[model samples]
Target: TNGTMMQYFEWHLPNDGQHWNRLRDDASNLRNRGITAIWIPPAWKGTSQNDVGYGAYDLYDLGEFNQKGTVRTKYGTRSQLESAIHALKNNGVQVYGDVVMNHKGGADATENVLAVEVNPNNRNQEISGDYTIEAWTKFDFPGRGNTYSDFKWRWYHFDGVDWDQSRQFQNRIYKFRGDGKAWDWEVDSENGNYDYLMYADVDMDHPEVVNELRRWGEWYTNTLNLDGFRIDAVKHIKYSFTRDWLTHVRNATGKEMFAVAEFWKNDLGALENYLNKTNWNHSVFDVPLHYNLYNASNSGGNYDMAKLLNGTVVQKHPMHAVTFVDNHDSQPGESLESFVQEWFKPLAYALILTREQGYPSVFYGDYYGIPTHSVPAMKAKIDPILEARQNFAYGTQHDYFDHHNIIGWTREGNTTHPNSGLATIMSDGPGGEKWMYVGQNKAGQVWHDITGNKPGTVTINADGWANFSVNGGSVSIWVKR
Candidate 1:
């Protein structure tokens, strides 16, 4: 079956505590549009009731307690989340949860601890000697009060913190000083060691910390009845922790667990190295492909359409890649912003939806629009491609990436699905025609472009070739009429 996944939340969604209810109502519509899986945002409470989930506050609190100044999370109550997941499952859609295990924020209390100042540029070099500094490392979960796990995190459980209450100098990373207290070596080597991201850095090497996180993983999976997870900040945390945690979760749940990681690196070698390290354990988001789309969108019609899929995870390791155009972090006004221009969106979506390379996901911001940022919904442009993927974007594929400005491909119709064949032609520069073979069996059938960019019908000749044309900087998907 043709499947599509959707990231069902945006960064600027209103803090009205009704998103889960909204998702519950959209289940049927999503399923009808050929969506097979949904990856929801962090379902747990963050630093506050309004935190957008990156400020990891309380993993055990999934909108179920009076912590973080509210009894509900930014999304909604725990009951609503469960209901939304249930509705999606009832519609035969799989639900994946976003899990943030890198750091903890909004500690309930502070304690004096010994720490040494580390150089911000190279974290391996210490700038100052070990001294006692007040750090907010006490997390007793006052609101939840150890209902699930009685593991109270102390200063020893973490590797470091970003802030010190007694500080009066410039801000710097304060690495805790204790017996065997050091930054984990098995992390991204960027900035010397990327072990500390923000807030309280979680040390996964400690036995108690590992056990607690594992127990929480099993508890959260059983509680929400989730199919899998979207592990956030895999590069910031210990790489082995992901392998062990994911393995433990799957063994505990007895499900294969279709998990994906946000290893947010653009180099193909880095991603390849990650895959080798993890033994292809889970798919990584194709940030390299997204960068290609971003660069192509900003090229002003000069980008080579032939190299669109070059050096990307989807091109090299399609099975271990989750292809996407834009996401919460890449949206306008967000960190890591690389918003693709609107004109090339249809072409990008067409390539991903029609190709048989990698799994694709539609972002909620692109589908529903970011009203807070004045971005209009692209449903009109994206819906046609989703429909094409559902009905005609299937079967064997033929590539036509021979031109620098124009590129096209065809899918030979199969016996299992109706109108399962389609020819996709797109141009980043001047519009032109490309002769591509659809299928020998469909030689005499008339085909029409669905996007209406170039409205006309052309019949395939006896040789199974048709010269399909598209407008400049646009895409046209021709299918059986």
Candidate 2:
């Protein structure tokens, strides 16, 4: 962390038909803003000519042997990319590579420049029939499978595909046709001529798939020696298998190999279950917290710092949570113009970074003249929030005390412990004359409102309840013995 760790901005390179210089300029801005890492798209070639970087047409396109197509796509050429990486590294910043080993381009894949002829009948091995989708029943009109006499019928499984029939193959790699090699799919491509259904699914349950992933992991560990990886669609991949995969990477590298999964669900149970399959050894993106922040603060109007922090609840497994206010997926309805203002951004920053639990990532993009209707118009904003976070040790603590909507927590300074610390207090409800006072039980019995710079007088109130009004838009902190 050399005090240079910064937010990852998914830079869209020109390789996928965007402009080329856009890559260099963004990288330059990131370097200027003191950001160390930029996780670009998986450099793999995709399925169709129209495919973006995610549609894997070939692995060779992933900076292979220096034959990578034009220095374009999400970032740009190997030389330009190296220049950008070198520029960043020269500027004391780091570059992380994005790898999607779980899947490759499907039967329709042509972006990789592979020599294989197009095969349409091989749809099963090429890609799964979008069964993992949320809406699974629409495919079955009214009459299907079982006896029509049996009035209520369960949703028909894929043709000749019985999820229950293969209970033992939860994470197994048996061939789909009972003899063919197992396969992995890619992302962001139309399956055949299908327009509405998008994305290629990976069959990670196959042992071959696991082996390939490990091989790719080792290759990454040996090659770029990348500081970390940002795995795509971690949720779609088999959860249990992912655990073994993470362990293998750590054991191979010995360094703290970090990975942030894109698990999109909001339910705690589902989130917890998905996390359960993941060893806390690696970091995970806080999807639930993102929703909470957007809902509680962005939509809920009066924010609940405690609820947002509490909603980030995960099993304390020594895993760090990569917390963020918004990202690409959050773009549909969430834009910088939509909720946060410039000044309020710093306030949000103060909350996230001050709460000593997860790694804080500040959203970049100029808020100046950014309109509410358009999100893409606003270029990356450069502010001192990241710098403040670094100087303040914003996310170094894990202990939080939550009482319904009222929350109080401390982020102890690395140089000095609790006495020299910062604290925050906020409510999710209408401004209450509600109050909270924090003080040591050991000796002095003195309480202080650090934000307001007021030293509260103690009366030995019997119930551990000390009353004081903490105003909105402010948090109190103090140096206590």
Candidate 3:
């Protein structure tokens, strides 16, 4: 399957009960535009009506109950969300729910708990002596009224909290140290221990916690008829636990549920280590590739086009990498802000969509543009590339990553797609030519630039070699005329 996913939320969508309805309306259109899957935002209730679903308050209340001072989430009510999912699936578009399992927020009460201060830089190291602190560790879910599960959380189920109600100010990482609970092992070692992120960090080692989560997983998949999950914050959660959870879900459903985790580190080594540790069961976002694209776009036309995929997860682990250009966190003013320059977006998109390696994911923000951020829609520049991926980007691929400033590649037409060969050339520096082989079968055929950046046609010689030209800081896709 030529799987293409679209993350269907932005930072500033209107907080009305209409997003689900809008999605329902656009499901067929998205499928027609080459989107195979849609990764919707967190559908559960959050700390407030304005929260972006990351501050998860109630998992069972997916905009169904009047919880956290809101009857519906930023998207819509439960019925509308269910309708949207049905519509997308009906249109042959898979739905991947955003699952935030690392922590819980907006507790209903506080409790005096025994804890010790841990170093913020290295959470494993104790910074101060054990002391009594009042932490927000009680979540009764009074609004939910024990409808789905009566799993009330207390201090024993959590490992740490950032706030201390006794001091009345947020300062350090308080590692809740009672009931035989320490920070769960087998997590990212960033900041010594990355198990604790924000709010009440759920203890994965707790048996009740694990069982409850597994039950919830089964319930969620069955109730919504979900195809898969877009797991959030894998770095902070127990690595082994996550793998087992996914396995459990798959076993229960008896279906190959596709899952992708947000590991968020820019280092390919870290991602490699994570994959190795987990035995490569789940896919992760290609964060290193995005950073490389961003750096090349801002390099003032001096970057080496040949080294674009170096040190990227997709370069080594293609099957397990989900390649992308930008997302919600990488947009303007966000923490992972490194938006690829608009000038080089077309080149970047062509690289992912046309290449038969990692599964390419298109950002909704990049496709439709973030209205609040003043970024214009890129449909005109990207639609042709999507069409080409659907029609022509098939069969054997040939690489020409020899030149530092200019590089090119070609695809020989497969039996399934006749006359589908394409010779793609791109440059980060001055305009130049590359003599690339399109295919022996395509000898003596004439090709024209589909991007229209270059005029006229070029004939392939008897040797299947043609000199293709590209403009500086631009790309050209030459296809059979």
Candidate 4:
């Protein structure tokens, strides 16, 4: 699809039942603005009314029950969410549901279970002897009893938990010891066995658990007519089960349902290994590219502009790379806070949007601006880039990644689009110019900077070469006038 996706929520949104409705109203506007798909937050009920959906309490409760502190989640109710999804699809914008299957939290009941403390640094090794501890594993879905599924969650469905009633506020990872349960295999080897994250870690090895998850996937996809899924915490889930589950869901649905996993890691090798293990059946967030943008933003105009795409999944595995600049975790004050400074945002966005490689996703916080954090919206700077992507970024691509602080590229417009050629240039250091070719067919054509980063115009030579210039630490898109 020749379109882009937007992560529809930030870390902190007003705890109101209006977000879904707002999204519904903004559907036409989003599609008009070049967004093909919208990656929405977890629509399920969280631990509390303001739990942000990550602290998943009830998977089936889509703000339809009062299981959490409130009936409606931070976003809205089930009806409103469904309406919004329909509205988005009506407006030609696909909806990608966020799936958090790594853990479950805010259980309604607790049970004393046999568990052993595992070293946080090395989860595969036990640190303390096995003992009985009260774990929050009983999830009977007190609200909306037996509405969708009568499945009840107990400690057996999980492999481990972080909190225990006896210890109360202990800072240790406890791997539950019962029925010879062990950590999930084929997961990230962060701390020996990094499968165990927070809350009640779901055990994918259990036959019942696997069946229940597959059932939920089918139900969720059909229930919302979901176009895709943004899977959360894939590294913490069993690789084999995840792959199989996705395969099952896709095959059962018989739709080209796109799925992008959140395997947040800066190391390219780690992501490559995950791709290899999963047999490249799905796409992953270009986390290494995000780090590169972050570092370049904080470099104070010293980073080499030519190396921007180096070591990025989009560079080597474009088809499997869902490229992005920032997300909820990378925002300020979050645990994975590595905010790309505002100065370099335009440059970073230009690199992703105007390229014909990976599936580029735009951050909602960047588009609409994070008002709560005093971050200004980048719409003024990003709109032209998006326009270029829609009309001009096509055909052959020419890369000029040989500079230290300045680099550029050009797109020779295709037969389908006339006068659609574009020349893009940016500098992380001092203001500089690059000799680039827009298209031999459009030789002697005059072009102007659509971003307005630079004034005046540029004239192409007989050979389709022009000297494209940009301000220091800035970006400019030269489109035919």
CA lDDT, every prediction? 0.90, 0.44, 0.88, 0.90
Return the clash pairs for model 3, or none: none
Q: Which runs of model 1 end up more than 4 angstroms from their true locations?
A: 168-170
TM-score of predicted model 4?
Answer: 0.98
Flag the better candidate by TM-score, 1 or 3: 1
Candidate 2 lDDT, 307-400, residue by residue in tens: 5555563323214566666554564443222334332343455455555456655443322222443434332222433433344333244344
In model 4, residue pairs whose N, Cα or C atoms come closer than 3 Å (at least 3 residues apart or on different chains), thus clashing, are none
Q: Which stretches of candidate 3 lie over 4 Å from their true place?
A: none
Candidate 3 backbone overlaps, count? 0
RMSD of each: 1.1, 12.8, 1.6, 1.1
Question: Candidate 4 — worst ten consecutive residues by lDDT sum?
Answer: 169-178
Q: How does residue 311 of candidate 3 score in lDDT?
A: 91
Q: Return whichever of 3 and 4 wins on TM-score.
A: 4
Residue lDDT tens for model 4, 372-478: 89989998898988888877888899999889888889999888977788999998889889999887787889899999999989999989899999998899999
User: Candidate 4: where is the Cα deviation over 4 Å?
Assistant: none
Ten contiguous residues with the weakest lDDT in model 1:
162-171
Q: Clashes per prediction?
A: 0, 27, 0, 0
Candidate 2 vs 4: which has more TM-score:
4
- Per-residue accuracy of model 1 over 277-375 as CA lDDT, tens digit each: 777899999999999999999999899889999989999999999999999989999988998788998898898888988999898988899998888
